[PDB]
Amino acid sequence: MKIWSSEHVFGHPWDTVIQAAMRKYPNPMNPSVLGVDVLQGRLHSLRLLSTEWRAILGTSRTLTYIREHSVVDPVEKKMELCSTNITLTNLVSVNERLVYTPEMTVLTQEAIITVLESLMANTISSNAKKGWAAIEWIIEHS
Amino acid sequence: KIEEGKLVIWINGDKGYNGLAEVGKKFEKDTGIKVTVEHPDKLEEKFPQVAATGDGPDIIFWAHDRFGGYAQSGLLAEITPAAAFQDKLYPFTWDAVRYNGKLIAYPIAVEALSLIYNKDLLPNPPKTWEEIPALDKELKAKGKSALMFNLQEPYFTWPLIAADGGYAFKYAAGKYDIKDVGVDNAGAKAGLTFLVDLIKNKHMNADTDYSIAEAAFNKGETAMTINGPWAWSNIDTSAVNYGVTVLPTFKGQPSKPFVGVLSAGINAASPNKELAKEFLENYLLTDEGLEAVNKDKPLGAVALKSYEEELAKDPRIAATMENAQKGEIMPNIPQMSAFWYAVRTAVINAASGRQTVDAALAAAQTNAAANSVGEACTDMKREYDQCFNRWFAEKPCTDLFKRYQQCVQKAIKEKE
Numbered sequence: 056m057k058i059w060s061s062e063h064v065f066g067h068p069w070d071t072v073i074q075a076a077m078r079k080y081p082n083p084m085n086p087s088v089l090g091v092d093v094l095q096g097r098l099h100s101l102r103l104l105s106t107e108w109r110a111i112l113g114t115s116r117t118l119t120y121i122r123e124h125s126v127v128d129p130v131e132k133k134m135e136l137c138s139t140n141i142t143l144t145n146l147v148s149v150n151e152r153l154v155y156t157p158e159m160t161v162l163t164q165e166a167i168i169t170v171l172e173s174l175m176a177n178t179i180s181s182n183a184k185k186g187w188a189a190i191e192w193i194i195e196h197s
Numbered sequence: 198k199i200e201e202g203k204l205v206i207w208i209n210g211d212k213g214y215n216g217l218a219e220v221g222k223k224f225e226k227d228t229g230i231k232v233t234v235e236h237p238d239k240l241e242e243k244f245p246q247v248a249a250t251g252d253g254p255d256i257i258f259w260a261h262d263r264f265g266g267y268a269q270s271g272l273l274a275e276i277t278p279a280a281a282f283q284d285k286l287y288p289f290t291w292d293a294v295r296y297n298g299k300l301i302a303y304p305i306a307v308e309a310l311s312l313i314y315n316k317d318l319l320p321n322p323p324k325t326w327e328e329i330p331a332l333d334k335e336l337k338a339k340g341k342s343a344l345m346f347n348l349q350e351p352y353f354t355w356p357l358i359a360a361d362g363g364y365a366f367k368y369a370a371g372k373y374d375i376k377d378v379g380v381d382n383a384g385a386k387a388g389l390t391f392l393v394d395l396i397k398n399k400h401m402n403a404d405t406d407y408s409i410a411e412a413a414f415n416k417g418e419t420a421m422t423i424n425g426p427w428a429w430s431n432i433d434t435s436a437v438n439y440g441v442t443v444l445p446t447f448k449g450q451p452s453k454p455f456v457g458v459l460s461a462g463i464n465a466a467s468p469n470k471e472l473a474k475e476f477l478e479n480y481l482l483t484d485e486g487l488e489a490v491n492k493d494k495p496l497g498a499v500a501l502k503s504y505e506e507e508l509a510k511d512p513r514i515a516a517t518m519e520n521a522q523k524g525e526i527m528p529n530i531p532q533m534s535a536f537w538y539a540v541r542t543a544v545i546n547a548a549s550g551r552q553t554v555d556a557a558l559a560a561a562q563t564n565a566a567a568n569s570v571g572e573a574c575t576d577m578k579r580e581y582d583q584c585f586n587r588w589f590a591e592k593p594c595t596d597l598f599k600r601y602q603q604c605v606q607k608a609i610k611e612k613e
């Protein structure tokens with residue numbers, strides 16, 4: 056059990072940050088993905104991300120699949136996205152909340168890892184740093 | 198559901214679908230089994246949509262590059278020709294329609310783009326791309342132009358982009374490296390920059406499409422075009438005196454067209470698998486069957502050895518082969534789908550001036566990202582995703598989504 060919390064503040068409107076948040080396939084992040092179930096008084100959205108990430112690699116020769124559940128329902132600016140690891144061994148859960156705090160916007164995230172574990176923890180934090188950067192990236196190129 | 202006791206075949210609208218329907222009549226005459234040949238719009242995108250629901254044609258024709266995507270999504274039946282039958286076609290053609298050790302289609306013909314020129318306007322066609330500006334300048338003085346070809350399909354510009362080193366996916370030891378896309382390198386940039394400079398200097402129009410380029414050549418307005426065997430037929434019915442030749446060199450390197458094997462796949466959901474095999478093996482892949490299609494629109498160099506020996510006498514076919522040999526066989530990996538659009542957008546954007554060459558290709562190298570869990574579903578996705586975002590200008594697109602979801606749900610079957 057390793058936990059991470061971080062918040063990052065985005066020098067951008069909430070709207071644009073959430074728009075970017077919806078896009079993967081950034082240069083920082085490799086993994087492919089798609090929107091399997093979405094319904095809207097509110098918006099819910101359900102995705103599957105295949106994420107690619109050497110003894111450990113042998114242990115997972117097969118590609119690892121990530122499930123995201125995210126809601127943006129309240130008129131009050133909000134998103135929540137929830138990630139699980141699809142395998143036979145140990146879990147990861149990452150939850151992000153994106154709302155703007157004094158419109159710039161800021162997120163607060165957690166990573167909860169269960170099973171070394173230090174590598175896993177180091178990796179998922181790095182992914183989160185990459186992710187902020189990718190959202191920053193996606194703005195420019197959208 | 199697909200209809201039992203009958204054959205429905207889909208083939209692209211630029212091909213000899215009337216000739217294929219003659220082969221179909223012959224099948225129907227011998228067996229009483231009706232054969233219907235259609236050419237749906239966007240058939241490469243439609244097939245995955247319908248087939249994902251177990252609907253669609255019994256047999257589908259497309260170039261082999263899209264087939265690995267379709268096979269991976271389970272839309273195609275494994276095919277099982279006897280050793281006897283396999284020996285009738287060139288080995289390399291079978292290799293194009295092999296995916297993961299299995300045959301997923303019958304190879305029909307080898308397609309490559311060539312330079313097509315009007316002998317009366319241009320008895321000596323240019324050997325290099327670099328000559329074309331000066332040629333065009335001279336032809337504009339006569340109220341003509343040097344060259345027009347379809348800019349709206351990256352198929353047609355790819356040979357130029359690839360000539361100095363553009364690629365799709367790296368290849369090493371029998372395996373394509375999908376983490377590396379070669380669409381943003383200096384060679385790729387040079388090629389596209391040449392094209393964009395042709396447009397900036399008024400030697401080409403950014404919106405030239407297949408039919409405009411076809412009408413311009415066959416009505417004698419432009420001295421050259423770039424196209425495949427299928428196009429020769431319409432030039433034959435014009436009064437243009439045409440030659441078909443090796444594509445121009447670029448920076449001293451051969452143009453490198455992407456080479457397609459036109460291939461015929463059987464819908465995995467078809468209840469007419471044996472009839473499809475009968476039709477393909479005993480009617481289409483014969484001297485007389487291929488001749489009938491070829492007479493409608495030329496197939497290129499056919500996979501069937503017996504008939505290729507006859508076709509190889511045609512200098513248009515020898516040109517086709519010279520270009521094919523200088524080019525590269527398309528990968529059939531499922532990612533090709535994403536690559537092809539990724540470039541389709543970049544070229545259109547650089548040509549129209551919405552993006553610089555550098556920014557257009559930089560964006561393509563990313564957009565080549567494989568883009569889906571479902572191998573054949575990538576377009577249904579791009580069609581949908583493109584909408585949901587536009588909808589986020591509201592916070593409609595449901596019609597696309599039902600289609601998107603089925604395709605990826607079918608692939609999600611063989612996983613968790």
Ligand SMILES: OC[C@H]1O[C@H](O[C@H]2[C@H](O)[C@@H](O)[C@@H](O)O[C@@H]2CO)[C@H](O)[C@@H](O)[C@@H]1O
Pocket residue numbers: 209211241259260261262263308350351352353457537
């Ligand atoms: O432009 C992208 C396109 O290239 C190839 O399509 C060719 C096709 O091979 C021929 O059958 C002919 O009709 O022209 C097409 C271009 O419009 C690939 O087969 C295709 O997958 C790719 O989308």
